[PDB]
């Protein structure tokens, strides 16, 4: 940290950036380097602006009368500023202070006394693990590591205390921002910090599983909800288990139809639904409706296709940084999944360039059937979804690379096989592009169960001992070994896959949540929506519609009171089975 | 099946029946000592057999779709276009594989049919074998303890009962009316696992009892003291 | 049932040290256990406090392997009794 420090005084050095002067270290400058340390979050702990911009005092700036990256506010320009009463979290000062240094029991000793107890670990985490990978220092960056699963599990312990005594009020703290830190709010800052352990704890998938199924209920079944999604008169019985219905609010069913729709399950049903009806669809226009021309049922797939890729740009528009265009499109760019969906796109565009044209549409008809299992990929990819299904196909997640592995291993083992068998036999059966049939393609039959015997079979002993090797070779060694070592690993990072499923839940929530519970038939409108919303507007200040609930103070001072007394209780605990462990006493 | 007019639709809605009491025969059969206390098991993968039905199905339907684009086929008649296109799907899964209808892209057919079959006889075969067995050890004291407590839900409903075979047992179903016709209040017998005990015998039991229970009592005080944490502490 | 008496009324307030002695003295030993492992268990899952209902879950199967022991020990000797035992009212 001093490293970084003495760096980004030369980054903005005295001359060309800090105008007037800047060999002097002040506290704009360790905003600035926890800034980059943390994400890209809201504007740092200590005052940015002309107020306090503390880059440019040892040159005479001019005071109070100049208010422009001097001194406005405060007292007197002394070679200083004045005193800055308290910057609103003291405490947290000298937390950030002694977690940069790596200093272990000093920063346990301060974190007892703090305020934002649950923000602060997570935060200290968060600096540890982003310091932690760029220390060249290997004993150091282990203990950096370390120390940051310790204050892990330290924010753990007391999210846990809280959550059992009324964890109705532990969500609300869980949502709550904190000024003190950035602006920002603790489960948010836990996506960041990558955090294993936390997002995986109880309360957790609780609040996630509550956000999701919106207003309704988490006790009715899925296989009964998908009834009601399809029978609209359905819904108004007495079959669902509301909220609303809980509470007899239902004054209005278009309003009690309003909150089923809006939450975000029956949104992600119906999407789902919709791309599996298209998906029907597109089959349906090549069997039938195999023509050089748009048919009636042909539009409809180009306006899918535009209505889909607009979804890329509303969520390039969603959350950006405001000067960086390309610097977020990285993010797209490293995400194989979006990668696969913008090369089904140009798959598609390859393919309709084919259709469009008379004189290929052979090439089109074998060109555009593997669009039909790519597309099933990506179906796939938004099914990691379910309680018995998510966390086992991350499995296959880990097993990606090594599908391609034991197909080149498998696929070059069944030529070894079909190369050798109608090598002694002799086989006359040959046309164009027919004889690789006979020679190749009546091998992999062979495997599993097309054997043509009265051709296959005075080479008879031959015949039976080749086909007992090479299966014996096949069925049993890259079989069932095949079944141990997908075991072993399934065991070995079973907790490891539950907990990443337990991560990634979290993301799906976030794309399902902040939009709106239009069909994707309609979702076009949604789309010219926000354009004339624009067509007025200028500046982009709609709305906000994120899981970021800001707090009156009353109520904020009523929950960090509690939370610091909990904060004791967890503390008191700990200290109590730290004695009772006996390897303690053995010391004592 | 009473309806003359309707006797093709009674020979189809009635075979389900034959598999649907297959399933209670099934549900009586939690019997033997070998067979019950992993039976708990599909009773613990009673709706992941659903679960896997969608997924499998689905995939299934992903490849039957798939194959019948490229090449041409031209078999159709009246719900029978529907068998040869999809019917022929998952035959050529278990092995039914018309190969000469099956097969210019014969590079292609080798190759679609070497994926999907690698996604499937590996990933969903094989991770599935991993998921039963460690699924399988995870519970399995609570799957054996589970049986053990259902044991004796057999055992009242077979005991309390009388020994006819289901053939006579209208003739007990009778008896018991028959009965009430000359009697009014319901204090026939009580054939329950309930032993009243003659005062002089339960006095002999209970000091029996609280003598085994103070010499129980001893031995765990003993343990207590014998533990090494508890020495820890002493 | 004197005793039976305060072991419930000690069940009931989850006075875990207090109940464990009152039950010492007691008569009709494994049904008075097995009595107050159920009576614990339904409190349990009625319980709003997660603390007290825990506990209460806790001390009803510390109960029941209180119940466990005795009856091995009434089991291994004099099993045809041990059965009667376990029928008796």
Same mark, same amino acid.
């Given at each position: 940290?001093?490293?970084?420090?003495?760096?980004?005084?030369?980054?903005?050095?005295?001359?060309?950036?800090?105008?007037?002067?800047?060999?002097?270290?002040?506290?704009?400058?360790?905003?600035?380097?926890?800034?980059?340390?943390?994400?890209?979050?809201?504007?740092?702990?200590?005052?940015?602006?002309?107020?306090?911009?503390? !880059?440019? $005092?040892? %040159?005479?700036?001019?005071?109070? &009368?100049?208010?422009?990256? @001097?001194?406005?506010?405060?007292? +007197?320009? #002394?070679?200083?500023?004045?005193?800055?009463?308290?910057?609103?979290?003291?405490?947290?000062?000298?937390?950030?202070?002694?977690?940069?240094?790596?200093?272990?029991?000093?920063?346990?000793?301060?974190?007892?006394?703090?305020?934002?107890?649950?923000?602060?670990?997570?935060?200290?985490?968060?600096?540890?693990?982003?310091?932690?990978?760029?220390?060249?220092?290997?004993?150091?960056?282990?203990?950096?590591?370390?120390?940051?699963?310790?204050?892990?599990?330290?924010?753990?312990?007391?999210?846990?205390?809280?959550?059992?005594?009324?964890?109705?009020?532990?969500?609300?703290?869980?949502?709550?921002?904190?000024?003190?830190?950035?602006?920002?709010?603790? !489960?948010? $800052?836990? %996506?960041?910090?990558?955090?294993? &352990?936390?997002?995986?704890? @109880?309360?957790?998938?609780?609040? +996630?599983? #509550?956000?999701?199924?919106?207003?309704?209920?988490?006790?009715?079944?899925?296989?009964?909800?998908?009834?009601?999604?399809?029978?609209?008169?359905?819904?108004?019985?007495?079959?669902?288990?509301?909220?609303?219905?809980?509470?007899?609010?239902?004054?209005?069913?278009?309003?009690?139809?309003?909150?089923?729709?809006?939450?975000?399950?029956?949104?992600?049903?119906?999407?789902?639904?919709?791309?599996?009806?298209?998906?029907?669809?597109?089959?349906?226009?090549?069997?039938?409706?195999?023509?050089?021309?748009?048919?009636?049922?042909?539009?409809?797939?180009?306006?899918?296709?535009?209505?889909?890729?607009?979804?890329?740009?509303?969520?390039?528009?969603?959350?950006?940084?405001?000067?960086?265009?390309?610097?977020?499109?990285?993010?797209?760019?490293?995400?194989?999944?979006?990668? +696969?969906?913008?090369?089904?796109?140009?798959?598609?565009?390859?393919?309709?360039?084919?259709?469009?044209?008379?004189?290929?549409?052979?090439?089109?008809?074998?060109?555009?059937?593997?669009?039909?299992?790519?597309?099933?990929?990506?179906?796939?990819?938004?099914?990691?979804?379910?309680?018995?299904?998510?966390?086992?196909?991350?499995?296959?997640?880990?097993?990606?690379?090594?599908?391609?592995?034991?197909?080149?291993?498998?696929?070059?083992?069944?030529?070894?096989?079909?190369?050798?068998?109608?090598?002694?036999?002799?086989?006359?059966?040959?046309?164009?592009?027919?004889?690789?049939?006979?020679?190749?393609?009546?091998?992999?039959?062979?495997?599993?169960?097309?054997?043509?015997?009265?051709?296959?079979?005075?080479?008879?002993?031959?015949?039976?001992?080749?086909?007992?090797?090479?299966? +014996?070779?096949?069925?049993?060694?890259?079989?069932?070994?095949?079944?141990?070592?997908?075991?072993?690993?399934?065991?070995?990072?079973?907790?490891?896959?539950?907990?990443?499923?337990?991560?990634?839940?979290?993301?799906?929530?976030?794309?399902?949540?902040?939009?709106?519970?239009?069909?994707?038939?309609?979702?076009?409108?949604?789309?010219?929506?926000?354009?004339?919303?624009?067509?007025?507007?200028?500046?982009?200040?709609?709305?906000?519609?994120?899981?970021?609930?800001?707090?009156?103070?009353?109520?904020?001072?009523?929950?960090?009171?509690?939370?610091?007394?909990?904060?004791?209780?967890?503390?008191?605990?700990?200290?109590?089975?730290?004695?009772?462990?006996?390897?303690?006493?053995?010391?004592?």
């Amino acid at each position: 940290f001093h490293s970084k420090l003495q760096k980004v005084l030369v980054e903005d050095p005295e001359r060309p950036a800090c105008a007037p002067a800047a060999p002097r270290l002040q506290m704009h400058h360790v905003a600035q380097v926890l800034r980059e340390l943390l994400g890209d979050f809201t504007q740092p702990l200590y005052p940015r602006p002309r107020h306090n911009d503390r !880059l440019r $005092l040892l %040159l005479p700036v001019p005071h109070v &009368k100049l208010n422009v990256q @001097g001194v406005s506010l405060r007292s +007197l320009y #002394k070679r200083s500023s004045g005193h800055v009463t308290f910057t609103m979290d003291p405490i947290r000062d000298l937390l950030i202070w002694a977690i940069v240094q790596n200093r272990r029991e000093l920063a346990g000793i301060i974190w007892a006394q703090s305020q934002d107890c649950i923000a602060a670990a997570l935060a200290c985490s968060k600096i540890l693990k982003e310091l932690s990978k760029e220390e060249e220092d290997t004993d150091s960056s282990e203990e950096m590591l370390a120390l940051a699963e310790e204050y892990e599990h330290r924010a753990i312990g007391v999210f846990t205390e809280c959550y059992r005594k009324d964890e109705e009020r532990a969500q609300k703290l869980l949502t709550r921002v904190s000024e003190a830190w950035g602006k920002t709010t603790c !489960l948010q $800052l836990a %996506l960041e910090a990558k955090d294993m &352990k936390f997002v995986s704890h @109880g309360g957790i998938q609780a609040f +996630l599983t #509550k956000v999701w199924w919106g207003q309704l209920s988490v006790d009715n079944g899925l296989w009964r909800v998908t009834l009601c999604m399809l029978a609209f008169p359905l819904l108004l019985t007495g079959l669902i288990s509301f909220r609303e219905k809980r509470l007899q609010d239902v004054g209005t069913p278009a309003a009690r139809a309003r909150a089923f729709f809006t939450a975000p399950v029956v949104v992600f049903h119906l999407n789902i639904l919709s791309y599996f009806a298209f998906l029907c669809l597109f089959a349906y226009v090549l069997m039938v409706d195999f023509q050089p021309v748009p048919s009636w049922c042909e539009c409809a797939i180009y306006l899918w296709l535009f209505s889909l890729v607009c979804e890329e740009m509303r969520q390039l528009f969603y959350d950006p940084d405001e000067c960086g265009l390309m610097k977020k499109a990285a993010l797209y760019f490293s995400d194989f999944w979006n990668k +696969l969906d913008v090369g089904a796109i140009l798959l598609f565009v390859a393919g309709l360039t084919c259709r469009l044209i008379p004189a290929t549409l052979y090439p089109g008809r074998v060109i555009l059937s593997l669009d039909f299992i790519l597309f099933c990929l990506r179906l796939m990819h938004i099914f990691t979804i379910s309680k018995t299904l998510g966390p086992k196909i991350i499995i296959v997640k880990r097993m990606m690379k090594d599908v391609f592995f034991f197909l080149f291993l498998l696929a070059v083992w069944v030529v070894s096989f079909g190369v050798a068998k109608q090598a002694i036999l002799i086989h006359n059966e040959r046309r164009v592009d027919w004889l690789f049939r006979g020679a190749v393609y009546h091998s992999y039959l062979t495997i599993f169960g097309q054997i043509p015997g009265y051709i296959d079979g005075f080479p008879e002993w031959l015949t039976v001992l080749l086909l007992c090797l090479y299966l +014996l070779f096949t069925n049993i060694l890259l079989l069932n070994l095949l079944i141990a070592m997908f075991n072993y690993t399934f065991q070995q990072v079973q907790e490891h896959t539950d907990q990443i499923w337990k991560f990634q839940r979290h993301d799906l929530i976030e794309e399902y949540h902040g939009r709106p519970a239009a069909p994707p038939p309609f979702i076009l409108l949604s789309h010219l929506q926000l354009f004339i919303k624009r067509v007025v507007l200028k500046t982009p200040a709609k709305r906000h519609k994120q899981l970021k609930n800001k707090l009156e103070k009353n109520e904020e001072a009523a929950l960090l009171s509690w939370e610091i007394y909990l904060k004791e209780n967890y503390l008191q605990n700990r200290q109590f089975q730290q004695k009772q462990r006996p390897e303690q006493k053995i010391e004592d």
